Design an enzyme around this catalytic site. Structure first.
Site, PDB file in Angstrom:
ATOM      1  N   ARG A 161       0.601 -10.745   6.715  1.00 38.31           N
ATOM      2  CA  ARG A 161       0.365  -9.393   6.406  1.00 38.31           C
ATOM      3  C   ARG A 161       1.484  -8.514   6.609  1.00 38.31           C
ATOM      4  O   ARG A 161       2.086  -7.466   7.915  1.00 38.31           O
ATOM      5  CB  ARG A 161      -0.484  -8.753   6.368  1.00 38.31           C
ATOM      6  CG  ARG A 161      -1.994  -9.514   6.194  1.00 38.31           C
ATOM      7  CD  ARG A 161      -3.278  -8.757   6.154  1.00 38.31           C
ATOM      8  NE  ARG A 161      -3.614  -7.835   7.840  1.00 38.31           N
ATOM      9  CZ  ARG A 161      -3.843  -8.270   8.845  1.00 38.31           C
ATOM     10  NH1 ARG A 161      -3.891  -9.465   8.985  1.00 38.31           N
ATOM     11  NH2 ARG A 161      -3.568  -7.545   9.843  1.00 38.31           N
ATOM     12  N   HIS A 198      -6.545  -7.471  13.280  1.00 34.34           N
ATOM     13  CA  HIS A 198      -4.979  -6.446  13.131  1.00 34.34           C
ATOM     14  C   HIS A 198      -5.128  -6.342  15.058  1.00 34.34           C
ATOM     15  O   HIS A 198      -6.290  -5.219  15.692  1.00 34.34           O
ATOM     16  CB  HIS A 198      -5.357  -5.693  12.023  1.00 34.34           C
ATOM     17  CG  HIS A 198      -3.690  -4.179  12.360  1.00 34.34           C
ATOM     18  ND1 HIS A 198      -3.567  -5.346  11.345  1.00 34.34           N
ATOM     19  CD2 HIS A 198      -3.570  -3.502  12.335  1.00 34.34           C
ATOM     20  CE1 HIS A 198      -2.093  -4.033  11.145  1.00 34.34           C
ATOM     21  NE2 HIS A 198      -2.638  -3.776  11.547  1.00 34.34           N
ATOM     22  N   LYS A 207       0.943  -1.387  -0.483  1.00 36.75           N
ATOM     23  CA  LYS A 207      -0.178   0.031  -0.121  1.00 36.75           C
ATOM     24  C   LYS A 207       0.362   1.334   0.144  1.00 36.75           C
ATOM     25  O   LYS A 207       2.265   1.197   0.725  1.00 36.75           O
ATOM     26  CB  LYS A 207      -1.196  -0.088   0.952  1.00 36.75           C
ATOM     27  CG  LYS A 207      -0.860   0.740   2.831  1.00 36.75           C
ATOM     28  CD  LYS A 207      -1.254  -0.899   3.966  1.00 36.75           C
ATOM     29  CE  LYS A 207      -1.828  -0.992   5.128  1.00 36.75           C
ATOM     30  NZ  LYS A 207      -0.947  -0.986   5.874  1.00 36.75           N
ATOM     31  N   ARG A 262     -11.243   0.135  13.908  1.00 37.41           N
ATOM     32  CA  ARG A 262     -11.281   0.599  12.719  1.00 37.41           C
ATOM     33  C   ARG A 262     -12.156   1.122  11.396  1.00 37.41           C
ATOM     34  O   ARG A 262     -13.430   1.087  11.409  1.00 37.41           O
ATOM     35  CB  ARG A 262      -9.557   1.174  12.108  1.00 37.41           C
ATOM     36  CG  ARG A 262      -9.187   1.572  11.282  1.00 37.41           C
ATOM     37  CD  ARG A 262      -7.558   1.505  10.805  1.00 37.41           C
ATOM     38  NE  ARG A 262      -7.544  -0.130  10.682  1.00 37.41           N
ATOM     39  CZ  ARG A 262      -5.961   0.378   9.683  1.00 37.41           C
ATOM     40  NH1 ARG A 262      -5.689   1.446   9.550  1.00 37.41           N
ATOM     41  NH2 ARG A 262      -5.621  -1.156   9.480  1.00 37.41           N
ATOM     42  N   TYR A 297      14.356  32.457   4.096  1.00 40.65           N
ATOM     43  CA  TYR A 297      12.954  33.456   3.904  1.00 40.65           C
ATOM     44  C   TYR A 297      12.894  33.400   5.315  1.00 40.65           C
ATOM     45  O   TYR A 297      13.340  32.595   6.504  1.00 40.65           O
ATOM     46  CB  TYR A 297      12.069  32.522   3.748  1.00 40.65           C
ATOM     47  CG  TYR A 297      11.116  31.871   2.504  1.00 40.65           C
ATOM     48  CD1 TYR A 297      10.467  33.246   1.251  1.00 40.65           C
ATOM     49  CD2 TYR A 297      11.222  31.097   2.034  1.00 40.65           C
ATOM     50  CE1 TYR A 297      10.805  32.679  -0.182  1.00 40.65           C
ATOM     51  CE2 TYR A 297      11.233  30.517   0.424  1.00 40.65           C
ATOM     52  CZ  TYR A 297      10.996  31.742  -0.217  1.00 40.65           C
ATOM     53  OH  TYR A 297      10.509  32.040  -2.070  1.00 40.65           O
ATOM     54  N   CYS A 311      12.957  26.122   1.710  1.00 40.11           N
ATOM     55  CA  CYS A 311      11.855  26.565   0.828  1.00 40.11           C
ATOM     56  C   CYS A 311      11.658  25.312   0.306  1.00 40.11           C
ATOM     57  O   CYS A 311      11.324  24.026   0.164  1.00 40.11           O
ATOM     58  CB  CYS A 311      12.916  27.144  -0.157  1.00 40.11           C
ATOM     59  SG  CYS A 311      13.776  28.928   0.701  1.00 40.11           S
ATOM     60  N   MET A 312      10.612  25.527  -1.103  1.00 41.69           N
ATOM     61  CA  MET A 312       9.860  24.614  -1.708  1.00 41.69           C
ATOM     62  C   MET A 312      10.916  23.679  -2.362  1.00 41.69           C
ATOM     63  O   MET A 312      10.051  22.836  -2.129  1.00 41.69           O
ATOM     64  CB  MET A 312       8.629  25.318  -2.711  1.00 41.69           C
ATOM     65  CG  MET A 312       7.501  24.250  -2.914  1.00 41.69           C
ATOM     66  SD  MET A 312       6.436  25.242  -3.959  1.00 41.69           S
ATOM     67  CE  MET A 312       5.153  25.391  -2.894  1.00 41.69           C
ATOM     68  N   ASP A 313      11.573  23.649  -2.881  1.00 45.25           N
ATOM     69  CA  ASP A 313      12.304  23.506  -3.777  1.00 45.25           C
ATOM     70  C   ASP A 313      13.551  23.169  -3.338  1.00 45.25           C
ATOM     71  O   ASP A 313      14.840  22.673  -4.327  1.00 45.25           O
ATOM     72  CB  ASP A 313      12.241  23.725  -4.820  1.00 45.25           C
ATOM     73  CG  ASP A 313      10.879  24.298  -5.687  1.00 45.25           C
ATOM     74  OD1 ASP A 313      10.189  23.209  -5.887  1.00 45.25           O
ATOM     75  OD2 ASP A 313      10.918  25.010  -5.660  1.00 45.25           O
TER      76      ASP A 313
END
Lengths: 380, 382
Positions: free
Chosen positions: B218, B165, B38, B135, B264, B310-312
């Site tokens: 699992r 689970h 998953k 759940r 920033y 920063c973002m990148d």
């Protein structure tokens, strides 16, 4: 496309169109808008936003690195694209063939690109100048001259523009802003001839000071309808419309008895006779574990996420016994109540910028334009 | 496939083969391994981990929702896949055509699905039992028997399995583990007959109590070489091999003079003459802003992140003038030094599970098998 889980984001392109057309109104006819569409357009959808913004008055686009620009080109965008970050000298031939403009800030870059590339396409370069940000950019006089000279000298290299970026343009206190503006005005003199596109302003300086932005504005966060800072909000010339919302649906509902535990580590204990709902969103969707005490909206009401957030699911304490399939809004409006991205950011102890960016590939985007469903984008 | 920024994640698929093979050695041969891939195999690449795991001894695969199972079919996986979470009754038909088993936990879902489907393919169902996680799952005998009946009555519905689970299997203290195991044993007697697959265990429960697993485990987080929690790290039977590492390269280097500000909000100020390096990775890459007081490795040495992220891109204080193009390791080894996902997780104040998951689509994955590169997967690739 379509999707087989009841969790989705909605992107309002009409809000993006209005945020752009209003700056197009507030700016001079001479002045271009470069819409910044990096990071899959801040998590809203790169093509869908790039297209909407060009319809609204933007003439150019900007991305963070070369793969983001080649991806826009592959999807049919033929408008101009500047890569704001760095690239490899060896990829200047690809940028050229695909008509992508590149940022330059070091002379050895050019020296190297020149050896490798002989033509036949031109490559348009934007010289970044570091004024006080400390990220990318040239800082000294003779490094600027050496770049200009290496560009002038090559047949296929063109200097189309130059720019800087402000560290504190969102800050009420303009004192580092006016140091950077002055440093820029001075560095512009190391250049023989002023190039065709001189730009300095992010969303903050372009909505605060639209005249002291020269002839191109880069417009980012405010396009998405999000304020640069809390501090800049009552200083902005028009209302921003918020474009992103996030929704899910109840997939299980159960009455828990006292002393019954919920989720990992069993850290929540039911104290009364409580109805608990499970929704199919979790931290692999970018709904991070730190949102554990936060309120989502179910049937017009705030409802707390109870117990630990799981990879794909989390639980909420319901007002009463609601039917499976009831819509839960995590970001957005449910009648009377609103959760904004700013709310989510408050709780995650970040800036708004970080939030739609983190909602992952796993979450479909449904797009709305002219008040109708336009498109579904499901990444997997 | 190809990528054009110098930021990538490497996934070592030999580590994944060893972690799964070691479990096939540990478990009884009659007990099968369901590998759970998953969330794009917990951020590592769904079909690459799925193919490796099925080589080492796994026989089934598990995913969170239907789109993830259908995406594995498109990339050529023919193994059984279980959707652990909820699905739409309307989609029963597609699941049955693509041989995807489903979790069921409520009779109104089956009431609704009998009405929309009438063969020819069988749909294999795994009934979920809530024994204490809160759940999904049945909690009552009247509802367990109703589901079983509605399944028995339709000719095309098949009960292949049954599961629960655990909420605290990764805690040293097994008291809630024991309530839940004993409650599953009582809940199983509410069924007319035992289906073929009874399962309960995750990575922690199966590494700790191999004998208490019935006939299918699992296996998730331990496949990737990450311990379920630090409590049980000494309790683990075999060494776990970490598969994920994250890397970048210096794209800009410069010396600052005393008093110059970085990033920033111009938080940071250099106080002597210092070399600042810029790397092309930021919070849209899942290298979140809260890591601003952490460090990365540059040339075998620890170096701090300086200023806001920063973002990148973000900046780091360097030891001195290093070349542009120097590898930076964010998660992984450089020499004698190492930064693990548990380190990042501690700084982020999360579990290790959340860290590879948040490294985004934007960051390419390079797969290694037999100590050589097998494939590159750039999600925003051409």
């Amino acid at each position: 496309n379509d999707f087989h889980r009841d969790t989705w984001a909605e992107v309002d392109l009409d809000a993006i169109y209005d945020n752009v057309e209003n700056l197009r109104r507030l700016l001079p006819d001479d002045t271009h808008i470069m819409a910044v569409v990096k990071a899959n357009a801040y998590g809203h959808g790169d093509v869908q936003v790039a297209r909407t913004a060009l319809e609204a008055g933007a003439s150019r686009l900007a991305v963070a690195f070369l793969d983001e620009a080649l991806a826009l080109r592959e999807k049919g965008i033929e408008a101009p694209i500047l890569v704001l970050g760095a690239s490899r000298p060896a990829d200047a031939a690809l940028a050229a063939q695909q008509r992508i403009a590149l940022t330059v800030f070091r002379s050895d870059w050019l020296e190297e690109a020149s050896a490798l590339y002989s033509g036949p396409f031109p490559i348009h370069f934007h010289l970044k100048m570091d004024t006080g940000m400390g990220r990318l950019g040239v800082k000294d006089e003779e490094e600027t001259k050496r770049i200009v000279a290496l560009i002038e000298r090559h047949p296929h290299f063109v200097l189309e523009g130059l720019y800087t970026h402000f560290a504190t343009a969102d800050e009420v206190n303009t004192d580092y802003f006016s140091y950077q503006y002055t440093r820029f005005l001075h560095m512009l003199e190391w250049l023989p001839s002023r190039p065709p596109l001189v730009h300095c302003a992010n969303s903050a300086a372009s909505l605060r000071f639209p005249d002291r932005t020269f002839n191109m504005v880069r417009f980012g966060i405010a396009m998405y309808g999000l304020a640069p800072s809390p501090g800049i909000k009552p200083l902005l010339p028009y209302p921003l419309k918020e474009a992103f919302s996030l929704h899910s649906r109840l997939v299980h509902v159960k009455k828990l008895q006292p002393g019954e535990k919920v989720s990992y580590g069993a850290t929540y204990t039911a104290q009364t006779e409580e109805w608990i709902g499970t929704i199919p969103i979790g931290y692999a969707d970018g709904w991070l574990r730190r949102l554990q005490h936060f309120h989502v909206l179910v049937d017009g009401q705030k409802a707390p996420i109870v117990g630990r957030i799981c990879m794909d699911q989390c639980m909420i304490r319901l007002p009463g016994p609601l039917p499976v399939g009831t819509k839960v809004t995590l970001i957005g409006r449910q009648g009377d109540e609103v959760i904004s991205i700013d709310d989510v950011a408050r709780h995650l102890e970040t800036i708004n910028y970080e939030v739609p960016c983190t909602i992952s590939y796993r979450v479909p985007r449904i797009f709305f334009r002219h008040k109708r469903i336009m498109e579904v984008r499901n990444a997997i």
